[PDB]
Amino acid sequence: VQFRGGTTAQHATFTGAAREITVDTDKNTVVVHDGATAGGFPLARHDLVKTAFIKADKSAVAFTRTGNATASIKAGTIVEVNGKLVQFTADTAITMPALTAGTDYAIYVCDDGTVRADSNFSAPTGYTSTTARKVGGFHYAPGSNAAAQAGGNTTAQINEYSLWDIKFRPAALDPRGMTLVAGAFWADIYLLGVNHLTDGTSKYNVTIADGSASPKKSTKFGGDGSAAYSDGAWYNFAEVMTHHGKRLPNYNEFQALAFGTTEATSSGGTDVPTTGVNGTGATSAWNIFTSKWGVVQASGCLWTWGNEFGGVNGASEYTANTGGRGSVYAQPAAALFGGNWSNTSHSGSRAALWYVGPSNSFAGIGARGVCDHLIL
Amino acid sequence: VQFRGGTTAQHATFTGAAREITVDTDKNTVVVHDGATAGGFPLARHDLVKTAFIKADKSAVAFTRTGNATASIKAGTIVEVNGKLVQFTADTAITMPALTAGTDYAIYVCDDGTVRADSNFSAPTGYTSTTARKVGGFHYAPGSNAAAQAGGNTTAQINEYSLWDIKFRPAALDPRGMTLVAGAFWADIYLLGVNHLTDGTSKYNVTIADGSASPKKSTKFGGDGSAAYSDGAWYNFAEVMTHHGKRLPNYNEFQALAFGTTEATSSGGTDVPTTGVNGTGATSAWNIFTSKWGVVQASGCLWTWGNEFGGVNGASEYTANTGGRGSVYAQPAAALFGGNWSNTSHSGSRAALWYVGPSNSFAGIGARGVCDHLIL
Amino acid sequence: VQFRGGTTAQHATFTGAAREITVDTDKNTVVVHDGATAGGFPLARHDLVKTAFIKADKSAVAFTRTGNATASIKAGTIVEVNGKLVQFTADTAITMPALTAGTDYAIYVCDDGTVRADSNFSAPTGYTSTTARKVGGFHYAPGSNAAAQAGGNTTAQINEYSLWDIKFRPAALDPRGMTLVAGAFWADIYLLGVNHLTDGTSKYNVTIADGSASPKKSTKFGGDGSAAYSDGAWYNFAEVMTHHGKRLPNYNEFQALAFGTTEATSSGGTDVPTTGVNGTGATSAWNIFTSKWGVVQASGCLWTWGNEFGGVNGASEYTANTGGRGSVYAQPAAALFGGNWSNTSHSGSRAALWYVGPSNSFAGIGARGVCDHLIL
Ligand code: MMC
Ligand code: MMC
Ligand code: MMC
Ligand code: MMC
Numbered sequence A, B, C: 001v002q003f004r005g006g007t008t009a010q011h012a013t014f015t016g017a018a019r020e021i022t023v024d025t026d027k028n029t030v031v032v033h034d035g036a037t038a039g040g041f042p043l044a045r046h047d048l049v050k051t052a053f054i055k056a057d058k059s060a061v062a063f064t065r066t067g068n069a070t071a072s073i074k075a076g077t078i079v080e081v082n083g084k085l086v087q088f089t090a091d092t093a094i095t096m097p098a099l100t101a102g103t104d105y106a107i108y109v110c111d112d113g114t115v116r117a118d119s120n121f122s123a124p125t126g127y128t129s130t131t132a133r134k135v136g137g138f139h140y141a142p143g144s145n146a147a148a149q150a151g152g153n154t155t156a157q158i159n160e161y162s163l164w165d166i167k168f169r170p171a172a173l174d175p176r177g178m179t180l181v182a183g184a185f186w187a188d189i190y191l192l193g194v195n196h197l198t199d200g201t202s203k204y205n206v207t208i209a210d211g212s213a214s215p216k217k218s219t220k221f222g223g224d225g226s227a228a229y230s231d232g233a234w235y236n237f238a239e240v241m242t243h244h245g246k247r248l249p250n251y252n253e254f255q256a257l258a259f260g261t262t263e264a265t266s267s268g269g270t271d272v273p274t275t276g277v278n279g280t281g282a283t284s285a286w287n288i289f290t291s292k293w294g295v296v297q298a299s300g301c302l303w304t305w306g307n308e309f310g311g312v313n314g315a316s317e318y319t320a321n322t323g324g325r326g327s328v329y330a331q332p333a334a335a336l337f338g339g340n341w342s343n344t345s346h347s348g349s350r351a352a353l354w355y356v357g358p359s360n361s362f363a364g365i366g367a368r369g370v371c372d373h374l375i376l
């Protein structure tokens, strides 16, 4: 059984009867008619709504944390996947795999109507990247977000603020290991590691980059994947953040991301070598410095370079201290935020040192990344 | 009358005749065939274009101001609402309610094809949030935008630059009370009020927050909704802006948002207690300081803290002045922009004082918010 | 032949048989039925997917450079245009016109299924703005991007990093003449010209704006299209960038955008009057200063004002030096980045001078614009 049909040009001067259905053979679509409107009312091909993703509440993430190791996709969520429509009319549990402290997970919606989390960011176990669509994710933290201003605990659990989806996410090239601070912007949960090219900037239980262990050189700026920078200059940390589509925090972002930490307190001892782990000789455990938003070692562990300049200036003479990329003159210090392990009662979410020039490198100075919140 | 149909798997190896129409029973959709292409050409379900909102000109807002108290939705605007398609093929008047000076309004498109404004931001009178879709809004100002560089008048009217829609808007969590500066970014029309938790940051005829009347403490940072900050430190104002997804202006944004104000002029007298109202002992009326873009009390009324540091530094010693959140060292002043009532001929759109540390609090220092322009 | 049909209200209490197709006469659409679901399953009108634009890889631009003067649109690209669906199942060559060094081109997808580039940004030759849809563009540069850290050559060719599309682009009001730096943000390929109102901020072979040739006054800030600023103050350059929805670079953006330039080297001689051209008395050719990302005269040619303050301060007294827009107090210098022609071995991608107040104007100080990267 074949229907009446014509080209698009034939369709333009043609008014079909009310409730008549024709077939545009150029478009391979149906055209609904009303007895008056020339051309009728063409319907949409499915190819043109591929990747559709509609939420009932576009101002919030598509998922709800329902417990330390459980979460749900929200009612009213409509997802296109592999030519099919999958929607959830009520809050629906996300099938969870084994969850491991300090690991990122991707949430998929599949064309058989299921929804599940997985450590694999291409496809979940038992599916392909065609039948399964990555729609978001979360971080399973080593400990709780801070309930007050005394850090968190060491109960591994989903960080609710780390929940992202494809229309509610960090603007960074890679969303993993980030958390949403006060609904306003995203911060890296962990201080920058040396091996950020493989790990990303934000990973649990890795060696922290500072003056004594410089980050791998960015492969977007002459790095080869093996060489590290000669030191931990501001320039190098800023270059690494840019590599990953992030930036160093300014003062307003730092006081936000670090709120919840134990204030006026430092880690103590002689070092903080590793993310999400007690420092060397520490008199306070790592979790004492978790922020409200799940930022780990948010203060009192290492200074982070900031994306702000001011305070004490270098000499008023052209000074070639930029790693061979020109000279600076009356160079203001680059901000340093948070305090390090040796900084006693002076650390905290508003700790700020404006003395160190950007060319300098020290063992207790590292970095944390941030980027914008994106709501589409 | 029932049509030929099959599952999606059955459909994959099936080539129907030209102009044949089958029904995918998994998808509950129609599939158009051509006599050659295996699988045919599935059509789109309406669920997958819910919330569609298409404009002829995506680089401009969807509405035009046609007079002090009238506006229109633009030709070529196509809106999905409650399962229905509503489009306007010509500029169409927006039905207005009573308009009240210093009030924000939401524009709705309804599933009966009407379009109207309303003071209610959930649903307009005579409709529900299901049958009516909020697509944008505007601010009805107490006075005109500045036609030159001598402020505006006191004729209540729609601020054309305050027109926003869901794909042409401030990136802030709440768009109300903001205006588009030079097409580049959004600025709060009013200086921050004390009661920003209920009012938002930008409201007409409310008590201005400064050192003598500190803002309500952010409920995202330990506030309970009743307590105010101990004072008007930079830290507190920056914290409030972050609460609302905004920031303090930098120098480039300030000179932009304040252009149109009466330059090198201050309010005079002893205070400016209230937004959009003459100061105490004022020798110039409030409207003298309206910018081109409808920013009220843009200069010469209160300094606004800025999101920039530089100028005179505090002591080169760890100083615990951050409200118990750590210490600062060689702390640069936080910028102050615009000038206050007592600042005589030194106020204006480029007025900048770089002497006051962020821990300080004074009666003529408050804040104004800004965030990015978002075109989707 | 007319189908069974009813209004939307009639449709709500009606359950048709499995594979029955009715016509909603309010919506002028088809409704697919299953024998159980009240209301059936309405299909989407094409009006609601107008401007649809779907890419297989949303994290990358929709086009690939295949040679100095050729490029392709990528497989999996689906485009709505003039009521029609046009998709490319394999990489497809873009038809090129004559290409001219230092020119921007727009890429169109047309409703006859073709794809082509054109110097006209409304419609390509042989088509209209209705039958042809602008989906992106590129810059055809006067020379290559830098392969190392020794600038580029003078072989005119497409700058791969200048490829933009409508969902992968600078957030600026006009994308032309910009390039994507490290996937993170966009930079103007050329230093600001005097005639930026007609040319935009970024054009090849035009007179560079500096203290000796000030930019045209912004028509958004009291300019009339003919008058230039009285001088090259920071204030004026910042105002021009804002006009175009851009900003001056900060230090982290500058070291990124200028990487690839010949470091610790200046143009020499007595001037650099023109974009993409050798300086007056130059001892190094212009192309020596091309960055990895195709930023022309990236360093060693003119300082660019930066969007950052710090270093040496002006007097601690109210100083009316803002062009009649108020006074400043303890005003920090505005950053200057890159070095100019006279700056010998001190120029480069990290060259930074923090001595000149924003009110000052000099022959070797101009500007370069940047704005955010937008992925939709
Ligand atoms: C999502 Hg399986
Ligand atoms: C913008 Hg990170
Ligand atoms: C919009 Hg009624
Ligand atoms: C970004 Hg406010």
Ligand code: MMC
Binding pocket: C107, C108, C109, C110, C114, C115, C116, C124, C127, C132, C133
């Ligand atoms: C694109 Hg013809």
Ligand code: MMC
Binding pocket: B372, C171, C172, C245, C246, C247, C370, C371, C372
């Ligand atoms: C935001 Hg330019």
Ligand SMILES: [Mg+2]
Binding pocket: A308, A309, A310, B308, B309, B310, C308, C309, C310
């Ligand atoms: Mg600064």
